[PDB]
Amino acid sequence: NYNTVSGVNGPLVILEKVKFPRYNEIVNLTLPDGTVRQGQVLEIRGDRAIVQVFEGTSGIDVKKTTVEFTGESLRIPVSEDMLGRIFDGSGRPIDNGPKVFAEDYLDINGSPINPYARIYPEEMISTGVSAIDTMNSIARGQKIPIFSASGLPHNEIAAQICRQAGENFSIVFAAMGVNLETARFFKQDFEENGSLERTSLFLNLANDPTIERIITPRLALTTAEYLAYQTERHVLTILTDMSSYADALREVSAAREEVPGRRGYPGYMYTDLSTIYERAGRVEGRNGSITQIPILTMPNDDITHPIPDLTGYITEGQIFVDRQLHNKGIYPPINVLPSLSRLMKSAIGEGMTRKDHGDVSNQLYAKYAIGKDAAAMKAVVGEEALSIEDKLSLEFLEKFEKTFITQGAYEDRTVFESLDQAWSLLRIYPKEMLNRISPKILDEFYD
Amino acid sequence: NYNTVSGVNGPLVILEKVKFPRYNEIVNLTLPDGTVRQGQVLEIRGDRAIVQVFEGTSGIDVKKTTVEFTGESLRIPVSEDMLGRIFDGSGRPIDNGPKVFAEDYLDINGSPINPYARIYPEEMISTGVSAIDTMNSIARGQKIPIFSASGLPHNEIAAQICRQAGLVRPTKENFSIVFAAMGVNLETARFFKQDFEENGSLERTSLFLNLANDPTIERIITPRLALTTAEYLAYQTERHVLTILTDMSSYADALREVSAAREEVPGRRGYPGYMYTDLSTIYERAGRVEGRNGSITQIPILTMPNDDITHPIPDLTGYITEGQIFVDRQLHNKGIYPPINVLPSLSRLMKSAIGEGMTRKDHGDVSNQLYAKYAIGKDAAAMKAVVGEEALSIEDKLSLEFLEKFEKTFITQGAYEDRTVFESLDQAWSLLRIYPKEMLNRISPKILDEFYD
Amino acid sequence: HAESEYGAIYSVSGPVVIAENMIGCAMYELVKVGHDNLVGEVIRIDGDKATIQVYEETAGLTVGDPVLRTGKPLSVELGPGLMETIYDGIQRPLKAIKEESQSIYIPRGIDTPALDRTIKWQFTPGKFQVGDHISGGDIYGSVFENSLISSHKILLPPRSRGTITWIAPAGEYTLDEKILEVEFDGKKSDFTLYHTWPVRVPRPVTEKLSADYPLLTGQRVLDALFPCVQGGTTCIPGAFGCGKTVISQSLSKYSNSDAIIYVGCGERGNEMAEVLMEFPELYTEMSGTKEPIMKRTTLVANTSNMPVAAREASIYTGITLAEYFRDQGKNVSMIADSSSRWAEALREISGRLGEMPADQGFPAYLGAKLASFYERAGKAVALGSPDRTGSVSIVAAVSPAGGDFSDPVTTATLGITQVFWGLDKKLAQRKHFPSINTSVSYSKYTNVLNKFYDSNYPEFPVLRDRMKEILSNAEELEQVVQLVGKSALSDSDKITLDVATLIKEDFLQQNGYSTYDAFCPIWKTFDMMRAFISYHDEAQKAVANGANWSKLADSTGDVKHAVSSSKFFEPSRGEKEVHGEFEKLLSTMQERFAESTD
Amino acid sequence: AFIILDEVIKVTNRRVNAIEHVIIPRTENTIAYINSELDELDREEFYRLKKVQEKKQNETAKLDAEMKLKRD
């Protein structure tokens, strides 16, 4: 421990003549204002040390502040009594309840999954939406990235998805600099569903420090890991407003004066992004399944930003929300072009959903693509819809857009209902118009 | 005076063995060749100091150079004898006259006007132009720029403005102006000289001329000298003060030059990050002072790079000064008289000089209606150029002929011909009379019944 | 106060001032530097040399000038008397400073009091009894600052709870005089009508509440398309001189809230001067007879010609003032002119500090300040026995270069905003009325706004969605007409285009300089949209009867001129004449139908 | 067939009208604005890289100063 410091650059603090320092360790500091806060040591060099403040370095005197270092890394108090309650960005109870009894204490960083002990989930979890469970198959244990825009109702769609979803499935949420209105709406939805008692999260708001929220996501991640490795139940991890998390990590790397990449991101970020995707996956011998489904906002409604690019390149598949369909007035705006699921492979076919699943999916992709090209042609050329193929393609595209694309947020439909609705919707196009459909699929539904 | 100097790199200087140096302090640099160059202090740290050379570090010995530091901030020898006499960008007489006796020594930096002490824009003026009257009004003491393109008649049209200014303004005591050039051309210098001579205001006005042959520091310092001079005229002299500044583009590129020479972290488009405030230094100085006679009316002139109105220079110009008068290359090659772009051009306060009690109640509504007919005429011109002459509506052809007539007649008057505001309102009422009765939706019933003969 | 905690000036370049030999100064702490004892805020610390950020002009200062650290953070005075008072970047009165210095210019190292200690006000103990236990936020008294707003609450200072000891009697007093004394476990503490609150931390409240109460915009596009409620965050990004300052003035004028806090940042002096000249001339005609716009608002001035840090400082001060107004149990608003100046100021700050830049020159902490400023305001129950429901709206102008959404300002603003009202340069360049993009401006608070407009049994959502659909279909019709021609369309599309033009000329466009269109009431716009929808439905029904759109438009000239004449109208009286005129329009449609047959 | 040949010819002319000052200009403006945005972004990134290289050079100069100090 050292009450003597050398210098302070922003939220980052640096002390001299420090001994037995631990890199990436939990440290408790008492400031001049009488306020006590928690922080993490960034680095240690020679006889000097460098630690960072998660709650901010503002309002602290160098002489009157005392830093007590544990000498060991950050250890979170994972417990099974956290169900239905709430915690803050630092972990403190925000539910106006007392401190619960801890079952165990371990690192918030989580643990690396063994190469031979991993398990590839084929499980099929119904999304409830006609455009979700069908297009990009929702699977417990898989990883589906979510990129949204500014002013986009991603919170409403995610909430409607968690609400029409539900051995039940426990949900763990992780907030990084989440907005006050976002927290209010999420609370309203979670309370409206009645599943709030079966859920728990660590809340770090916008009014609160967002820099201590990076550990909050890690805390919720250790919570999901402890839920999967002990409780043996279906688990879903979610990181909210991950864009603020990337901006904060970028701020931390920028304060370090290290080699900056695009959008101020760190150079070793290649591993860092993995930590956001390492909150998912199952193990051999565990009945439970942990699946992380983070959501972030692509800058200036551009997926070309480092954030959406890394989120898409790392995780398998991504769920996209178009600004046009959201400005159209229709229900949930999933773009069949950009949206995809790598878990839609093992979850299709007989024994999982239906034998007409994959075929109708590929046919849907072809119909959407042909309809899009037909839209470009209808825009460039006249209203005659470019001969025959483009006319049926554009008509079927618009029809599928006004029906199949919008299933509603408050409505929960099965996969069979969406398959039948698609069966009624594909009747406009000829049976020989589908090049993605085989002989068995063409003779599948003649009803 | 410290004769000790340490390093020299590019166009800068560093000295040691000194203390208590002042920010932007005047410093005299005596070189090894006997050359005396004026310079300003950049930064001061401990026993070390760093300053910037105006005349450049070219041809200067390290240990053989001596420097006398005044220690005082940027200082200029302002006086009342500046009227009629010409001064250079370096302050030295270019008129080959004797030593000018300074009435007061004041900082050229300029002092920001207190908000409570700031008086609202009022009255009006006649620039001799219909567009400087009808479309966008020009208040007396207000600040409006002129955005032109390279090769265009910026100097000539501005000359028309400065020449017709004091002549037409009385129709709303001669008006006194101030001419300022920063890193400008010899051809433009001769043109401006012949213009100021032709106006005969050369006796009643002062000129600060920094040639392009001169250094960039002098060009950047010319604006400051003009600021202190115009301030001394609009406060101490208590007279009507017109401020004419030119070649803002040169000062901008030179600003980028100084910003890069220090290898500082640049903002958008390679300019300085303080550019908003750097321009605001001389930009927000314009206005009226309550209780104090006279005012400073800023009429700056800038040149958009590659004739691009979307350029960062013009964008920052609009972001600093309030409102601007655009000169388009579209109408400059049309052969008609001076090319004002109706869309981009706008006035800071066009509501201050309108209404009854100022000029007339037929001004503003006619401006909105005429602007509407012109814009509708432009869109209709595009539509007519697209589909065809038989494919356009009646309003399309009517507004087309109206805009064409507005461009050929209203927009074209003359440079040495100063059109009175009344003539502008009459010609405008006659131009609007060309349109139908249901044509103007921006006009009131009374004005419509009154204007039609 | 003769404490003499002092570091020495080391390196000075521009606005940034690094001072060494001071380990006592804290981060974001107030300090008096230079020989002129200028106020400033220390930023970083390196070794024995702490980097300090000056909020004033550093010109003229020299090495060796002492810097005294207060050790405490930025603070401003909260209470009565600040209203209708212009405070500078140092939070000092502009009129009093100009009168004291006896100069129209701005001095350096000047110290002046926020409020007037010689100012007297009539304060009365609001229903509170002596000896009763009180805490922070409770109203200890009430004073009338203006002729409209009465009983400005004197709040008990923060971090104070206990029992009322010596509470002095009601009467005439000043801001520097203690009106009460409270006994607690911390022994004795003196309580006054004026309470000091830190500018770094906004004035706290009880608990966050959902805002279902719509705030009146007065403009059709601001109330309908992109809606803003009381406590809602509505962005107003615009180009340079696009009427951004004008839209801000219009917003602070026609506002239906109680008070207004307007802090100019890097704006023109002529704007604030014109504001000061036209504030007093305009008087309220509502309740509280004889009351101007100047007395119902407060103005903070950080000039473009002023220091760079003065903008962010005046912004934070305006935020603390708006938070204090929200803690006062009244609906208020913050009008910020050119937040981009404060952002660029942050860019020059992080840039001069040696920190690495990312995009548009700014630092990486921009999002934190933007999101904090956006989530700071809102509608919430305040602290104290009073248990009032307070509201604070945030209105911030962004000035991106060339009006591009790619600018850091536009993105950072759009990210934390629940509502955004965009400004276009297309209709602004043509000297047309207020320009807003129907394909851009949107609001996420529009739903609860529809729920709130249903209280008046108006149709916000229906009329807005119908008009937006008509606008989009007419825009596509514009793309098609521009593609092929106007002869390639049908009667319905042409009706959609004509209706689009009618909605453009007679609805979205309203003259602010006019004696009528300057302010549009809720009932006026609702009746206008309803009559427009009625004429649209009647025309659509008439077109379905087999009549051409042009033939229908032949005898409909009267209804058209009548629909275009609904902009003028009159005062609150005569709404019945308008609704009745609509009825006469439907009747006219029936007459036309009779005329057709035959 | 002649009449239709006229009408269709008009259609072709209309396309020529759209491919002249409309499509071509739109593509030109799009390409120019995209070029400016991309070149500016590359300029910003290059500025970050220049600052990074300058940081490495200054740190290296501090290393050199340390070596000289050790020598002294």
Distance to chain B for C9, nearest Cα, Å = 9
> Please, what is the angle between helix C522-543 and helix C460-483, to 10°?
50
Question: Could you give the C-alpha distances from C230 to A331, B386, C99, C202, C217, in angstroms and in order?
Answer: 28, 47, 38, 18, 10
What whole-number distance in Å separates Cα of residue B57 and Cα of residue B59?
Answer: 6
A342 annotated ligand binder? yes
Q: Check if the beta carbon of residue B276 is closer than 8 Å to that of residue B316.
A: yes
- Contact B/A (≥3 CB pairs under 8 Å): no
Cα B436 from chain centroid? 39
What whole-number distance in Å separates Cα of residue C97 and Cα of residue A427?
Answer: 80
Residue B336: Cβ within 10 Å count? 13
In chain D, what residues touch B387 (CB-CB under 8 Å)? Answer: 14, 17
Mutation choice for C interface testing from B43, B142, B276, B390 by most C CBs within 10 A: B276
Distance to chain A for D63, nearest Cα, Å = 15
In chain B, what residues touch D22 (CB-CB under 8 Å)? Answer: 386
3-state secondary structure of C390: strand
Q: Which residues pair with A296 in a beta bridge?
A: A147
Q: Which residues pair with C254 in a beta bridge?
A: none
D55 lies within 8 A of chain A by CB: yes
| Contacting A residues, span 225-264, partner chain D, CB-CB under 8 Å | 257, 259-260, 262
Question: Could you give the C-alpha distances from B402 to B372, B373, C417, C434, in angstroms and in order?
Answer: 11, 7, 44, 24
Phi-psi domain of A301 (left: phi exceeds 0; alpha: psi -120 through 50; beta: other): left
What whole-number distance in Å separates Cα of residue C73 and Cα of residue A268?
Answer: 37
| Contacting C residues, span 356-395, partner chain A, CB-CB under 8 Å | 356, 358-359, 363-365, 367-368, 371-372, 374-376, 378
Cβ–Cβ gap D54/B263 under 8 Å: yes
Phi-psi domain of C4 (left: phi exceeds 0; alpha: psi -120 through 50; beta: other): left
A379 lies within 8 A of chain C by CB: yes
Q: Which residues pair with A93 in a beta bridge?
A: A87
Q: Check if the beta carbon of residue A355 is closer than 8 Å to that of residue A440.
A: yes
Residue C386 burial (CB < 10 Å; 0-12/13-18/19+)?
Answer: middle
What whole-number distance in Å separates Cα of residue C489 and Cα of residue A272?
Answer: 56
Give residues after which chain A gaps, C-N over 2.5 angstroms.
Answer: 166
Exposure of B421 in the CB half-sphere (CA atoms within 13 A): 27
Question: Could you give the C-alpha distances from A43 to A37, A257, C116, in angstroms and in order?
Answer: 19, 13, 52
B277 lies within 8 A of chain C by CB: yes
Cβ-proximal residues to A437 (8 Å cutoff; 6+ apart), any chain: A359, A362, A363
Distance to chain D for C359, nearest Cα, Å = 7
Cis geometry, peptide bond prior to residue B308 (ω within 30 degrees of 0): no
D51 lies within 8 A of chain C by CB: yes
Question: Could you give the C-alpha distances from B185 to B190, B212, C349, in angstroms and in order?
Answer: 9, 6, 36
The residue assigned the tokens 């402890």 is A226
Q: Check if the beta carbon of residue C231 is closer than 8 Å to that of residue C393.
A: yes
Q: Nearest Cα to A378, choosing from D12, D11, D5, C484?
A: C484
What whole-number distance in Å separates Cα of residue C224 and Cα of residue C522?
Answer: 10
Cβ–Cβ gap D48/C357 under 8 Å: yes
What whole-number distance in Å separates Cα of residue B216 and Cα of residue B251?
Answer: 7
Q: Check if the beta carbon of residue C416 is closer than 8 Å to that of residue A179.
A: yes
CB-closest option in D22, D43, D47 to B265: D47
Residue type, D59: E
The residue assigned the tokens 């501005």 is B158
Q: Check if the beta carbon of residue C443 is closer than 8 Å to that of residue C234.
A: yes
Name the neighbours of D, counting chains with at least 3 Cβ pairs within 8 A: A, B, C
Q: Write out the two tokens for A184.
A: 């209010």
Cβ–Cβ gap C304/B320 under 8 Å: yes
Q: Nearest Cα to C395, choosing from C336, C454, C438?
A: C336
C104 lies within 8 A of chain B by CB: yes
Residue type, C519: F
Q: What is the DSSP string of A121-161?
A: -------SSTTTTTTS---TT----EEE-TT--HHHHHHHH
Give residues after which chain B gaps, C-N over 2.5 angstroms.
Answer: 172
Cβ-proximal residues to A86 (8 Å cutoff; 6+ apart), any chain: A93, A94, A95, A200, A201, A203
Phi-psi domain of B326 (left: phi exceeds 0; alpha: psi -120 through 50; beta: other): beta
Exposure string over C421-433, b if 16+ CB within 10 A, otherwise e? bbbbbebbbbbbb
C238 annotated ligand binder? yes
CB-closest option in C44, C418, C444 to A8: C44
B35 lies within 8 A of chain C by CB: no
Distance to chain B for D42, nearest Cα, Å = 11
What whole-number distance in Å separates Cα of residue A19 and Cα of residue A17?
Answer: 7
Q: Nearest Cα to B17, choosing from B46, B41, B43?
A: B46
Method: X-ray
Q: Check if the beta carbon of residue C314 is closer than 8 Å to that of residue C298.
A: no
B23 lies within 8 A of chain C by CB: yes
What whole-number distance in Å separates Cα of residue B157 and Cα of residue A177?
Answer: 56
Cβ-proximal residues to C126 (8 Å cutoff; 6+ apart), any chain: C139, C141, C142, C151, C153
Cα C95 from chain centroid? 24
Sheet with strand A319-320: strands edge to edge: A295-297, A146-148, A319-320
Q: Nearest Cα to A295, choosing from A226, A234, A244, A225?
A: A244
A111 lies within 8 A of chain C by CB: no
What whole-number distance in Å separates Cα of residue D52 and Cα of residue D60?
Answer: 12
What whole-number distance in Å separates Cα of residue C47 and Cα of residue A8?
Answer: 8
Residue C447 burial (CB < 10 Å; 0-12/13-18/19+)?
Answer: middle
In chain D, what residues touch A257 (CB-CB under 8 Å)? Answer: 55
3-state secondary structure of C314: helix
What whole-number distance in Å separates Cα of residue A129 and Cα of residue A132?
Answer: 5
Q: Check if the beta carbon of residue A108 is closer than 8 Å to that of residue A137.
A: no
The residue assigned the tokens 């800068």 is B12
Q: Which residues pair with C20 in a beta bridge?
A: C8, C49
Cβ–Cβ gap A8/C405 under 8 Å: no
Distance to chain D for B405, nearest Cα, Å = 24
C243 annotated ligand binder? yes
Residue A52: Cβ within 10 Å count? 20
Q: Check if the beta carbon of residue C400 is closer than 8 Å to that of residue C424.
A: no
In chain C, what residues touch D22 (CB-CB under 8 Å)? Answer: 482
Q: Check if the beta carbon of residue A317 is closer than 8 Å to that of residue A342.
A: yes
Residue C435 burial (CB < 10 Å; 0-12/13-18/19+)?
Answer: buried
Q: Nearest Cα to B71, choosing from C64, C6, C16, C105?
A: C64
Cβ–Cβ gap A327/C442 under 8 Å: yes
The residue assigned the tokens 């909020």 is C55
Q: Nearest Cα to B433, choosing from B377, B373, B352, B354?
A: B373
In chain B, what residues touch C277 (CB-CB under 8 Å)? Answer: 119-120
